[PDB]
Paper text:
In order to assess whether these permuted macrodomains retain important structural characteristics, we solved the X-ray crystal structures of the isolated permutated macrodomains found in Dictyostelium APL and O. sativa Q10MW4. Structural analysis of this novel macrodomain indicates it has retained the core features of this domain family, including the α-β-α sandwich fold consisting of a six-stranded β-sheet flanked by α-helices.
The macrodomain of APL has undergone a circular permutation. This mutation is apparent in all dictyostelids in which the genomes have been sequenced. Consistent with the permutated macrodomain of Dictyostelium APL being able to interact with ADP-ribose, we observe that this domain is able to bind ADP-ribose polymers in vitro.
Author numbering: 1 to 221
Amino acid sequence: SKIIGPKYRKKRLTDALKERSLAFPFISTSTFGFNIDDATEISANAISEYLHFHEKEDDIKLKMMVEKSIYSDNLIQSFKKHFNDKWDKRFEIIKIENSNSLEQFNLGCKLFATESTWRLKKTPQNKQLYEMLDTGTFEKVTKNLYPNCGKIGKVYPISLQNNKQLVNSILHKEYGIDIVILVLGVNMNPNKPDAFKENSELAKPLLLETYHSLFNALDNF
């Protein structure tokens, strides 16, 4: 759970099969209940940090999936403000109806991130994803790779490719996903595991570290 920060790596020439195209949620904002003003600033700033560092790397495509309820003109303006009116062409926000909507899966990204918990198991919010992967198969592969389970602020990539049991998933074969990344963002919701208290001094630092971890995974990926 120790904070490690960004470990980003510039790549000018890349393998098209290893393109850094990531679909990811607006971490901790819906079910987890993270303060949206705070999540917006952290998200926008982390995104801009990564994209600026990687100026001129055109393989990178970032698609942030935002639930309809949270999506607003004010939200988009807030992002614009953090980007100093220079919104990077490589970053898009995609409105989805809810965390289980089918529209989220065919966005053309080789890496697909989902929120998870320490258990690294299916949640009610990513049920649809897990049905598509086959729950038992994916959970078994997850447990084999990460036998000591997950820590808040970290991500856990699982390849659908090198993974024999998952290669035939619609997610891989039809929707072009190579890697599913389980993202352990900060939960603020008393009804979900490992809830942080409202003014925890660790909440903001750990959400940022979640983004760093995610983008570190992308740069390896």
